Design a protein around this ligand. Structure first.
Ligand SMILES: CC(C)NC(=O)c1cc[nH]n1
Ligand SMILES: CC(C)NC(=O)c1cc[nH]n1
Lengths: 412, 412
């Protein structure tokens, strides 16, 4: 019968920092992680900026020998997983290794590595493809490599649900524990899609902000002058743990994961319905799953991508789910500062949602200079807002019309 | 407690045929789907053959315009999904669409699309990349497009667990129904990695058979002369349905899904442990999940990839799990005929496992001319074997040491 699930460990790379604390200081201070991209020549691209992980040192985590075999998205996912597991204090043993699994996901996976090997194939021939091309590129190898390094023999898998990946990964890892398939899961996601194919592909769809002359002002969720999302890189990992297992070992508990919702829009490959009907169904699933009155919700970490259609669909969903209480809760998009980490978006934002509960503060939506038509909720414009937060909700929406909601609350 | 899950519809593209009954007919006749790959210059490649889908007409499923937007792996997934829903006779309504979801996965995803867009990018620059590049290439677009086409609003997600994807997708979909998160799921996997990157990538790891002179003899699981797996394309989809929901509408029930096991080897990125310790844990997990004794298992659809270490690990794992029953069960690799569909291997092999139950026949392991050291089990060499099958197992073991086992039982 269904067991309770708590957060005992968290880990992160983001455009704001190489761990959770540094990233969170940037969030509360309203700092942008967005800058012109330096790792490649983007002069032929319509977008030349994004949220890069600055100063990442893989040799804090892995031998340069192993690191060389792995796409940056895998390196990013391992760094976050390693932080989270260390932050948990949990020791892996023969007694518990079978009860500890991993679900670290990615939207796109090893596009950089696949691009570079594609260049080798075309310019030179097949004999120049890396022997590590497959194991070093495919999405399941964050889970695989983490399991190999730490000796985790529990459920081992990976989701790929586009910009929903991080939220789905965390939610389904909670269900693993809830239903007794595991007692501990490392769950979240990682993304590094800032290669020619990534920036070019989102560019070809005209989905990206082209504000190249003011990158820190580009991500402006619900602002009338928004012109698409800002592509960002990194990773979020959480240690999910059955409550009694956590209590037994005297774990520090950040918060409890009480609710998880999924829905499909069944609307469009890439566009949300204007009314946010699928997002509404998802949040209602998650709130019923948590046994909550919707009026208990204090803070929503929005998907808030800074696209015209996405941002307004989200307001519509929140107003429909929460009615008059829509005017009392605080909703913000930390994508205003981090940009959009795609498959890792739900993972870092799940961590921001927990830290909102720990510190009792709503992170700001920066750059919200002129809220758009109907964007008249508390969106925590410009500055972090100290306030009572017992229940925090984190929304993700993706291509395919795939929706995820996580519900966290304070644990005493 | 837990609801019961039955299979009411199945769909497939394989190297043996463009649907289930044509594929199954090839399986029971010991026909190979393996041949030199056409319309592709493989001169510089160490492997020149594989299992291609022959004569696929996407316009039986999609308009030419909608098909142009999607990678072959997505077209194949949609084909199997539409076949499976049609085969189930399910009628989607406003009263049930929120209870019907999709989990169709891929191991490798849109390599063919990535390859063709790399060609444009390198030669001409980013502005020649297709606008549909991203949504037409990401793994969750089979679930996405299927949900949009049929109006499915239930759980919408995609697994990517390398060669374990199909097994994990079906297993976790069965969980959704068992624990009341959905009443129906479409689950399975699709793959098309017979591009330069798939043949080249696997080729660079020397993981592939190079028997270019005799492509039909290349896949020879447990034969002393095997020299690696054969890369194959296609898809499997199953309609999973709660038992009472299936009985109420008078659905035709092929079989019951009674058990699902997961484990991680936590051993190596590409290599199984010699004793198959992880595959043994996963099979034990699956049997415990089913409430079944190892003695009650009659038929195993092996992973049986035709790799040196993989084949021998699976013999050890079966001997370990099944003790004095290990010789009484029949175990075959249908990969001897189909080759290895990677992420779709588990989907098509779940369907073959279900059909073994319907038809009371163990599919052959063809090319098993000289069993290797220790390969002394009933591996159904050369020809199909009619026999009593009440309980059938399907195993998948994948890169990162991720393992899946499905347990199916006759339903009467
Ligand atoms: C990512 C796209 C497909 N969807 C949204 O932005 C969205 C916002 C509210 N509901 N859905
Ligand atoms: C695909 C690799 C990682 N593993 C196997 O083939 C295998 C065989 C027995 N256990 N695992």
């Amino acid at each position: 019968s269904r067991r309770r699930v708590v957060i005992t460990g968290m880990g992160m790379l983001s455009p704001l920092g190489l761990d959770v604390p540094s990233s969170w200081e940037g969030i509360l201070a309203g700092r942008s992680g967005i800058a012109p991209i330096e790792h490649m020549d983007l002069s032929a691209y319509s977008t030349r900026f994004g949220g890069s992980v600055k100063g990442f040192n893989v040799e804090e985590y892995l031998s340069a020998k192993e690191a060389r075999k792995l796409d940056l998205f895998i390196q990013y996912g391992l760094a976050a997983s390693f932080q989270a597991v260390r932050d948990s204090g949990l020791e892996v043993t023969d007694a518990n290794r079978e009860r500890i699994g991993v679900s670290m996901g990615s939207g796109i996976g090893g596009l950089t590595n696949i691009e570079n090997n594609c260049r080798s194939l075309f310019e030179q021939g097949p004999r120049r493809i890396s022997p590590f091309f497959v194991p070093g590129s495919i999405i399941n190898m964050v889970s695989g490599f983490l399991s190999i390094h730490l000796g985790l023999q529990g459920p081992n898998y990976a989701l790929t649900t586009a910009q929903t990946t991080g939220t789905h990964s965390i939610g389904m890892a909670a269900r693993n524990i809830a239903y007794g398939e595991a007692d501990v899961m490392v769950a979240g996601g990682s993304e590094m899609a800032a290669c020619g194919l990534g920036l070019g592909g989102f560019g070809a769809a005209r989905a990206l902000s082209t504000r190249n002359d003011e990158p820190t002002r580009a991500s402006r969720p619900w602002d009338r002058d928004r012109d698409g999302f800002v592509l960002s890189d990194g990773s979020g990992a959480l240690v999910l743990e059955e409550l009694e297992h956590a209590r037994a070992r005297g774990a520090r508990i950040y918060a409890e994961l009480v609710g998880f919702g999924m829905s499909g829009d069944a609307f469009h490959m890439t566009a949300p319905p204007e009314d946010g009907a699928g997002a509404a169904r998802c949040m209602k699933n998650a709130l019923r799953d948590a046994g909550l009155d919707p009026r208990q919700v204090d803070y929503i970490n929005a998907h808030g991508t800074s696209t015209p259609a996405g941002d307004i669909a989200e307001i519509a969903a929140v107003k429909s789910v929460f009615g008059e209480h829509a005017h009392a809760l605080s909703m913000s998009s930390t994508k205003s500062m981090t940009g959009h980490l795609l498959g890792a978006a739900g993972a870092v934002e799940a961590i921001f949602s927990v830290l909102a509960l720990r510190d009792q503060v709503a992170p700001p939506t920066i750059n919200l200079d002129n809220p758009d038509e109907g964007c008249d909720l508390d969106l925590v414009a410009h500055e972090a807002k100290p306030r009572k937060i017992d229940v925090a909700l984190s929304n993700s929406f993706g291509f395919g019309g795939t929706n995820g909601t996580l519900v966290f609350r304070r644990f005493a």
